[PDB]
């Protein structure tokens, strides 16, 4: 039970963070941050400066 609901919640958190980065790139930042890698449920990697 812990494995199933912990894995789902953590990948949900990663999906929320990816959606937030797409909001920041579209609205206010824009090429000051870029998504390098995104594997859904596995990893997210952003590039600044």
């Amino acid at each position: 039970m812990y494995n199933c609901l912990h894995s789902f919640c953590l990948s949900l958190q990663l999906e929320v963070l990816h959606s937030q980065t797409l909001m920041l790139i579209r609205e206010r930042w824009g090429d000051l941050v870029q998504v390098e890698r995104y594997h859904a449920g596995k990893c997210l990697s952003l590039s600044v400066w």
Binding site: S7, F8, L12, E15, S19, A40, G41
Partner: peptide, 25 residues
Amino acid sequence: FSSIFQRQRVDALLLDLRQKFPPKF
């Protein structure tokens, strides 16, 4: 006499949960 349209991503995550954790009767 709704659906907030961020549910595509949640649904793909549900399918990944189905695969990563299968149901067991």
